[PDB]
Amino acid sequence: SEKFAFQAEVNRMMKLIINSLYKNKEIFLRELISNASDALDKIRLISLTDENALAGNEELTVKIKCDKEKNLLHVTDTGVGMTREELVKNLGTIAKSGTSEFLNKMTEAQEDGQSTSELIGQFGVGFYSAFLVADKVIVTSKHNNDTQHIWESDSNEFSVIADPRGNTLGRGTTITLVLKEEASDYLELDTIKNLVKKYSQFINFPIYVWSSKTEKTVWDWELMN
Numbered sequence: 001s002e003k004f005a006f007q008a009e010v011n012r013m014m015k016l017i018i019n020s021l022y023k024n025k026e027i028f029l030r031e032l033i034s035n036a037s038d039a040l041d042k043i044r045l046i047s048l049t050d051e052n053a054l055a056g057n058e059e060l061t062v063k064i065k066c067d068k069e070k071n072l073l074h075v076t077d078t079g080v081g082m083t084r085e086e087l088v089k090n091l092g093t094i095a096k097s098g099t100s101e102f103l104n105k106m107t108e109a110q111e112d113g114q115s116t117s118e119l120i121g122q123f124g125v126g127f128y129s130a131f132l133v134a135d136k137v138i139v140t141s142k143h144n145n146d147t148q149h150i151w152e153s154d155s156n157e158f159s160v161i162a163d164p165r166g167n168t169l170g171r172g173t174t175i176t177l178v179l180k181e182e183a184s185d186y187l188e189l190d191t192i193k194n195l196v197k198k199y200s201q202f203i204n205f206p207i208y209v210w211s212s213k214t215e216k217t218v219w220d221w222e223l224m225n
């Protein structure tokens with residue numbers, strides 16, 4: 001277990017994003033789904049050049065799960081996943097060149113009254129908007145080139161640890177949101193299914209929500225797109 005501070009610019013970026021989307025919190029789920037989609041594209045593109053790419057997990061899905069009792073929301077993809085060093089660098093620092101650009105266009109647009117939600121989506125920085133609804137964000141990731149690890153943060157710092165549960169994802173990433181008290185509605189299946197549907201019509205991968213039929217109850221993955 002290693003402890004880390006966020007880079008200064010990521011602290012600023014977190015605040016810009018939270019402020020930009022404060023009255024549209026639900027866009028957090030849009031961005032998590034987009035990130036999962038990009039991750040599935042990446043492994044799909046890798047499988048064109050590497051016969052083993054999918055060996056760790058033969059599926060390509062996004063699977064969402066509400067856990068009312070533990071107050072958790074889980075967004076799981078079987079995409080490319082992240083190595084330990086990518087968990088640290090990609091989430092904890094300004095890692096790409098596009099991210100800096102985003103910082104400039106965001107502040108210029110935000111002073112000029114121009115729309116910013118598109119900026120967040122364009123540059124793929126929406127991960128941080130999970131903090132509008134969660135007190136704790138947890139990222140479990142398994143990448144073909146590393147062992148499974150857990151990233152966790154309350155936004156005031158983050159830590160990364162080897163997952164003691166070993167390789168349970170096979171390949172891919174689970175974003176786990178410890179929801180704020182004011183965000184318990186994101187644990188309701190009807191809420192989540194409408195949002196998931198709303199945000200997944202463009203995803204070139206199937207997206208499922210763990211749902212109940214129903215005194216007899218049957219739970220199963222329900223395709224959303």
Ligand SMILES: CCCNC(=O)[C@H]1O[C@@H](n2cnc3c(N)ncnc32)[C@H](O)[C@@H]1O
Pocket residue numbers: 035036039077079080081082090091099124125126127128173
């Ligand atoms: C740039 C703003 C924060 N950085 C990310 O979201 C990056 O983290 C990684 N990331 C986030 N969610 C991911 C996922 N589900 N699978 C793989 N990488 C992911 C991607 O490299 C994103 O560019």
